[PDB]
Amino acid sequence: STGSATTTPIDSLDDAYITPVQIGTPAQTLNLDFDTGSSDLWVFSSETTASEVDGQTIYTPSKSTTAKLLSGATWSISYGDGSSSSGDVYTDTVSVGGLTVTGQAVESAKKVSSSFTEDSTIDGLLGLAFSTLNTVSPTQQKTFFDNAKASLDSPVFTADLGYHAPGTYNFGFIDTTAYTGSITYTAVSTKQGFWEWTSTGYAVGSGTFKSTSIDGIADTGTTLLYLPATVVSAYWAQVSGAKSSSSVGGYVFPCSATLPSFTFGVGSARIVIPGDYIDFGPISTGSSSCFGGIQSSAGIGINIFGDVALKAAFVVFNGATTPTLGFASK
Protein backbone atom coordinates (compact mmCIF):
# COMPACT_ATOMS: atom_id res chain seq x y z
CA SER A 1 0.00 0.00 0.00
CA THR A 2 0.89 3.67 -0.21
CA GLY A 3 -0.48 7.02 0.91
CA SER A 4 0.00 10.59 -0.30
CA ALA A 5 -1.27 13.74 1.43
CA THR A 6 -0.74 17.43 0.88
CA THR A 7 0.76 19.42 3.74
CA THR A 8 -0.02 23.14 3.97
CA PRO A 9 1.70 25.97 5.88
CA ILE A 10 -0.45 27.30 8.73
CA ASP A 11 0.51 30.92 8.05
CA SER A 12 2.50 33.21 5.77
CA LEU A 13 5.77 32.42 7.60
CA ASP A 14 5.60 28.61 7.35
CA ASP A 15 5.54 28.42 11.15
CA ALA A 16 4.24 24.85 10.86
CA TYR A 17 2.53 22.60 8.34
CA ILE A 18 -0.82 20.80 8.67
CA THR A 19 -1.91 17.63 6.93
CA PRO A 20 -5.50 16.33 6.90
CA VAL A 21 -5.98 13.00 8.70
CA GLN A 22 -9.14 10.88 8.76
CA ILE A 23 -9.96 9.40 12.18
CA GLY A 24 -12.81 7.07 13.01
CA THR A 25 -15.97 5.84 11.35
CA PRO A 26 -17.52 7.83 9.79
CA ALA A 27 -14.33 9.78 9.20
CA GLN A 28 -13.58 12.83 11.31
CA THR A 29 -10.96 14.88 9.46
CA LEU A 30 -8.48 16.75 11.66
CA ASN A 31 -5.51 18.81 10.49
CA LEU A 32 -2.45 17.47 12.25
CA ASP A 33 1.13 18.65 12.53
CA PHE A 34 3.30 15.77 11.29
CA ASP A 35 6.26 15.72 13.64
CA THR A 36 9.34 13.60 12.93
CA GLY A 37 10.68 14.75 16.31
CA SER A 38 8.05 13.00 18.45
CA SER A 39 6.08 9.77 18.56
CA ASP A 40 2.57 10.48 19.84
CA LEU A 41 -0.54 10.93 17.69
CA TRP A 42 -2.68 13.22 19.83
CA VAL A 43 -5.75 15.27 19.08
CA PHE A 44 -8.00 17.96 20.43
CA SER A 45 -11.14 16.13 21.43
CA SER A 46 -14.54 16.21 23.07
CA GLU A 47 -12.59 15.47 26.28
CA THR A 48 -10.35 18.56 26.06
CA THR A 49 -10.93 21.09 28.83
CA ALA A 50 -13.36 23.53 27.24
CA SER A 51 -11.43 26.68 28.15
CA GLU A 52 -8.40 25.22 26.34
CA VAL A 53 -10.18 24.79 23.00
CA ASP A 54 -10.28 27.86 20.74
CA GLY A 55 -11.27 27.11 17.15
CA GLN A 56 -9.69 23.68 16.71
CA THR A 57 -11.58 20.80 15.17
CA ILE A 58 -12.11 18.07 17.76
CA TYR A 59 -12.22 14.29 17.63
CA THR A 60 -15.33 12.88 19.33
CA PRO A 61 -14.71 9.19 19.98
CA SER A 62 -18.32 8.55 21.02
CA LYS A 63 -19.34 9.35 17.42
CA SER A 64 -16.94 6.80 15.94
CA THR A 65 -18.24 3.25 15.65
CA THR A 66 -14.66 1.93 15.48
CA ALA A 67 -13.30 3.81 18.53
CA LYS A 68 -12.41 1.77 21.59
CA LEU A 69 -11.09 3.10 24.89
CA LEU A 70 -7.63 1.71 25.57
CA SER A 71 -8.37 0.78 29.15
CA GLY A 72 -6.09 2.32 31.76
CA ALA A 73 -3.85 4.07 29.25
CA THR A 74 -2.80 7.68 29.74
CA TRP A 75 -0.28 9.92 28.03
CA SER A 76 1.59 13.10 28.83
CA ILE A 77 4.11 14.85 26.64
CA SER A 78 6.37 17.82 27.16
CA TYR A 79 8.04 19.14 24.02
CA GLY A 80 11.47 20.75 24.10
CA ASP A 81 9.94 24.19 23.55
CA GLY A 82 7.99 23.95 26.81
CA SER A 83 4.59 23.16 25.29
CA SER A 84 2.67 20.14 26.53
CA SER A 85 -0.50 18.08 26.45
CA SER A 86 -1.93 15.00 28.15
CA GLY A 87 -4.96 12.75 28.30
CA ASP A 88 -6.30 9.25 27.70
CA VAL A 89 -6.20 6.90 24.73
CA TYR A 90 -8.50 5.32 22.18
CA THR A 91 -7.73 2.97 19.35
CA ASP A 92 -9.43 3.80 16.06
CA THR A 93 -9.01 3.70 12.30
CA VAL A 94 -6.68 6.38 11.00
CA SER A 95 -6.08 7.18 7.33
CA VAL A 96 -3.55 9.53 5.75
CA GLY A 97 -3.75 10.23 2.03
CA GLY A 98 -5.50 6.93 1.34
CA LEU A 99 -3.30 4.77 3.60
CA THR A 100 -5.29 3.19 6.43
CA VAL A 101 -4.18 1.81 9.79
CA THR A 102 -6.69 0.01 11.97
CA GLY A 103 -6.18 -0.04 15.73
CA GLN A 104 -4.03 3.10 15.78
CA ALA A 105 -3.55 4.66 19.21
CA VAL A 106 -5.29 8.05 19.10
CA GLU A 107 -4.32 10.02 22.16
CA SER A 108 -7.21 12.23 23.25
CA ALA A 109 -6.18 15.43 24.99
CA LYS A 110 -7.79 16.32 28.27
CA LYS A 111 -5.32 19.18 28.74
CA VAL A 112 -3.20 21.24 26.35
CA SER A 113 -0.82 24.11 27.06
CA SER A 114 -1.52 27.68 26.03
CA SER A 115 0.55 27.60 22.83
CA PHE A 116 -1.70 24.82 21.48
CA THR A 117 -4.92 26.56 22.52
CA GLU A 118 -3.74 29.77 20.85
CA ASP A 119 -3.08 28.08 17.52
CA SER A 120 -6.50 27.45 16.03
CA THR A 121 -5.03 25.83 12.90
CA ILE A 122 -3.43 22.78 14.54
CA ASP A 123 -5.85 20.07 15.67
CA GLY A 124 -3.11 17.83 17.10
CA LEU A 125 0.19 16.16 16.24
CA LEU A 126 1.06 12.99 14.37
CA GLY A 127 4.43 11.75 15.57
CA LEU A 128 6.83 10.15 13.11
CA ALA A 129 9.94 9.61 15.27
CA PHE A 130 10.69 6.15 16.66
CA SER A 131 8.05 4.46 18.78
CA THR A 132 10.48 4.20 21.70
CA LEU A 133 9.62 7.87 22.42
CA ASN A 134 5.87 7.26 22.64
CA THR A 135 4.54 8.46 26.01
CA VAL A 136 1.54 6.15 26.50
CA SER A 137 1.59 4.40 29.87
CA PRO A 138 1.56 1.66 31.01
CA THR A 139 1.73 0.13 27.52
CA GLN A 140 3.74 2.14 25.00
CA GLN A 141 2.06 2.53 21.61
CA LYS A 142 3.31 2.52 18.03
CA THR A 143 3.37 5.44 15.63
CA PHE A 144 1.19 5.54 12.54
CA PHE A 145 4.27 4.81 10.41
CA ASP A 146 5.38 1.90 12.58
CA ASN A 147 1.88 0.38 12.34
CA ALA A 148 1.70 0.92 8.57
CA LYS A 149 5.24 -0.16 7.78
CA ALA A 150 4.80 -3.84 7.05
CA SER A 151 1.92 -3.10 4.65
CA LEU A 152 3.73 -0.40 2.70
CA ASP A 153 5.24 -1.13 -0.71
CA SER A 154 8.55 0.11 0.78
CA PRO A 155 9.13 0.92 4.48
CA VAL A 156 9.63 4.64 3.93
CA PHE A 157 7.95 7.99 4.12
CA THR A 158 9.04 11.23 2.48
CA ALA A 159 8.71 14.88 3.45
CA ASP A 160 8.55 17.47 0.68
CA LEU A 161 7.77 20.72 2.47
CA GLY A 162 7.06 23.86 0.48
CA TYR A 163 8.43 27.35 0.92
CA HIS A 164 5.38 29.57 1.37
CA ALA A 165 3.45 26.86 -0.51
CA PRO A 166 1.91 23.42 0.01
CA GLY A 167 3.98 20.26 -0.15
CA THR A 168 3.57 16.53 0.26
CA TYR A 169 3.99 13.64 2.68
CA ASN A 170 4.17 10.27 0.92
CA PHE A 171 4.11 6.87 2.58
CA GLY A 172 5.43 3.69 1.02
CA PHE A 173 7.07 5.04 -2.14
CA ILE A 174 9.61 7.53 -3.44
CA ASP A 175 8.22 9.94 -6.05
CA THR A 176 11.14 10.17 -8.46
CA THR A 177 9.56 13.21 -10.14
CA ALA A 178 9.64 15.25 -6.92
CA TYR A 179 13.38 16.00 -6.78
CA THR A 180 16.34 16.83 -8.97
CA GLY A 181 19.59 14.90 -9.22
CA SER A 182 20.08 11.97 -6.86
CA ILE A 183 19.12 11.22 -3.27
CA THR A 184 22.12 10.99 -0.95
CA TYR A 185 21.56 8.63 1.95
CA THR A 186 23.25 9.02 5.32
CA ALA A 187 23.37 6.97 8.53
CA VAL A 188 20.86 7.35 11.34
CA SER A 189 21.26 6.73 15.04
CA THR A 190 18.02 5.73 16.76
CA LYS A 191 19.64 5.73 20.21
CA GLN A 192 17.73 8.83 21.34
CA GLY A 193 14.55 7.89 19.47
CA PHE A 194 15.05 10.54 16.76
CA TRP A 195 15.99 10.60 13.09
CA GLU A 196 19.48 11.60 14.20
CA TRP A 197 22.24 12.01 11.63
CA THR A 198 25.54 13.81 11.06
CA SER A 199 25.86 16.60 8.54
CA THR A 200 29.30 16.89 6.93
CA GLY A 201 29.55 20.69 7.18
CA TYR A 202 28.27 24.02 5.95
CA ALA A 203 28.83 27.12 3.86
CA VAL A 204 27.50 30.66 4.19
CA GLY A 205 26.43 32.30 0.95
CA SER A 206 29.04 31.87 -1.76
CA GLY A 207 31.71 31.16 0.86
CA THR A 208 33.95 28.13 1.12
CA PHE A 209 32.52 24.92 2.53
CA LYS A 210 33.65 24.09 6.07
CA SER A 211 34.01 20.36 6.63
CA THR A 212 32.85 19.63 10.15
CA SER A 213 30.58 17.00 11.69
CA ILE A 214 27.26 18.35 12.94
CA ASP A 215 25.09 15.79 14.73
CA GLY A 216 21.42 16.72 14.71
CA ILE A 217 17.86 15.58 14.16
CA ALA A 218 15.62 15.81 11.11
CA ASP A 219 12.56 17.36 12.73
CA THR A 220 9.54 18.42 10.67
CA GLY A 221 7.85 19.59 13.88
CA THR A 222 10.41 22.33 14.59
CA THR A 223 10.14 25.52 12.55
CA LEU A 224 13.73 26.75 12.52
CA LEU A 225 17.27 25.50 11.96
CA TYR A 226 19.18 25.23 15.28
CA LEU A 227 22.94 24.79 14.93
CA PRO A 228 26.07 25.26 17.06
CA ALA A 229 26.82 28.82 18.15
CA THR A 230 30.01 28.93 16.08
CA VAL A 231 28.13 28.10 12.87
CA VAL A 232 25.28 30.49 13.61
CA SER A 233 27.66 33.35 14.43
CA ALA A 234 29.47 32.77 11.13
CA TYR A 235 26.15 33.00 9.26
CA TRP A 236 24.84 36.18 10.91
CA ALA A 237 28.22 37.91 10.65
CA GLN A 238 27.46 38.12 6.91
CA VAL A 239 24.30 40.18 7.54
CA SER A 240 24.92 43.86 8.28
CA GLY A 241 23.24 44.88 11.50
CA ALA A 242 22.36 41.35 12.62
CA LYS A 243 22.78 40.63 16.31
CA SER A 244 21.76 38.19 18.99
CA SER A 245 19.08 39.74 21.18
CA SER A 246 18.59 38.22 24.61
CA SER A 247 15.34 40.20 25.00
CA VAL A 248 13.86 38.85 21.75
CA GLY A 249 15.33 35.37 22.22
CA GLY A 250 17.71 34.95 19.30
CA TYR A 251 19.30 36.51 16.27
CA VAL A 252 17.48 39.39 14.69
CA PHE A 253 18.38 41.35 11.60
CA PRO A 254 17.26 44.49 9.79
CA CYS A 255 14.20 43.70 7.70
CA SER A 256 15.86 45.71 4.88
CA ALA A 257 18.62 43.09 4.57
CA THR A 258 19.14 40.62 1.78
CA LEU A 259 20.00 37.31 3.50
CA PRO A 260 22.71 34.98 2.19
CA SER A 261 21.97 31.33 1.53
CA PHE A 262 23.11 28.60 3.88
CA THR A 263 24.43 25.26 2.64
CA PHE A 264 24.58 22.05 4.66
CA GLY A 265 26.39 18.86 3.78
CA VAL A 266 24.87 15.42 3.39
CA GLY A 267 27.82 13.15 2.75
CA SER A 268 29.51 14.62 -0.32
CA ALA A 269 26.25 16.28 -1.40
CA ARG A 270 25.09 19.79 -0.59
CA ILE A 271 21.64 21.22 0.19
CA VAL A 272 21.28 24.96 -0.35
CA ILE A 273 18.79 26.90 1.78
CA PRO A 274 17.98 30.15 -0.06
CA GLY A 275 18.35 33.32 1.97
CA ASP A 276 14.64 34.10 1.83
CA TYR A 277 13.88 30.83 3.69
CA ILE A 278 15.78 32.27 6.67
CA ASP A 279 13.49 35.32 7.04
CA PHE A 280 10.82 34.93 9.74
CA GLY A 281 9.58 38.47 9.48
CA PRO A 282 9.08 41.31 11.93
CA ILE A 283 9.61 40.42 15.58
CA SER A 284 6.30 42.19 16.32
CA THR A 285 3.79 43.75 13.96
CA GLY A 286 5.23 46.83 12.28
CA SER A 287 8.78 46.32 13.51
CA SER A 288 11.76 46.74 11.19
CA SER A 289 13.66 44.10 13.17
CA CYS A 290 13.18 40.65 11.67
CA PHE A 291 13.62 37.26 13.32
CA GLY A 292 16.24 34.90 11.94
CA GLY A 293 15.52 31.38 10.76
CA ILE A 294 18.93 30.05 11.82
CA GLN A 295 19.40 30.10 15.59
CA SER A 296 21.82 28.71 18.14
CA SER A 297 21.22 25.26 19.59
CA ALA A 298 23.35 26.10 22.62
CA GLY A 299 21.37 25.04 25.67
CA ILE A 300 18.97 22.88 23.63
CA GLY A 301 21.40 20.00 23.91
CA ILE A 302 20.93 18.92 20.30
CA ASN A 303 21.11 20.46 16.85
CA ILE A 304 17.79 20.53 15.00
CA PHE A 305 17.34 20.42 11.23
CA GLY A 306 13.84 21.87 11.35
CA ASP A 307 11.59 23.07 8.57
CA VAL A 308 13.97 25.85 7.41
CA ALA A 309 16.44 23.13 6.41
CA LEU A 310 14.08 20.34 5.43
CA LYS A 311 11.94 22.46 3.10
CA ALA A 312 15.03 23.04 0.92
CA ALA A 313 15.14 19.29 0.23
CA PHE A 314 13.21 16.20 -0.67
CA VAL A 315 13.73 14.06 2.46
CA VAL A 316 13.44 10.29 2.71
CA PHE A 317 12.81 8.75 6.12
CA ASN A 318 13.87 5.17 5.44
CA GLY A 319 12.47 2.85 8.11
CA ALA A 320 14.18 -0.30 6.91
CA THR A 321 15.70 -2.61 9.55
CA THR A 322 18.66 -0.24 9.66
CA PRO A 323 17.06 3.18 9.20
CA THR A 324 18.69 5.88 7.06
CA LEU A 325 17.86 9.39 5.86
CA GLY A 326 18.00 10.55 2.26
CA PHE A 327 18.25 14.13 0.99
CA ALA A 328 17.87 15.44 -2.55
CA SER A 329 17.73 18.93 -3.96
CA LYS A 330 14.46 19.90 -5.64
From Swiss-Prot:
UniProt-listed Enzyme Commission number(s): 3.4.23.22
Highest taxon, organism lineage: Eukaryota
Domain Peptidase A1: 17-328
GO biological process: proteolysis
Molecular function terms, GO-annotated: aspartic-type endopeptidase activity
Catalytic activity field: Hydrolysis of proteins with specificity similar to that of pepsin A, prefers hydrophobic residues at P1 and P1', but does not cleave 14-Ala-|-Leu-15 in the B chain of insulin or Z-Glu-Tyr. Clots milk
Entry annotation: catalytic residues: 35, 199
SS bond list: 255-290
Keyword Protease carried by entry: yes
Entry keywords, A to Z: Aspartyl protease, Disulfide bond, Hydrolase, Protease, Signal, Zymogen
Keyword check for GTP-binding: no
Family to which the UniProt record says this protein belongs: Belongs to the peptidase A1 family.
Descriptive protein name: Endothiapepsin
Organism: Cryphonectria parasitica
Annotated gene: EAPA
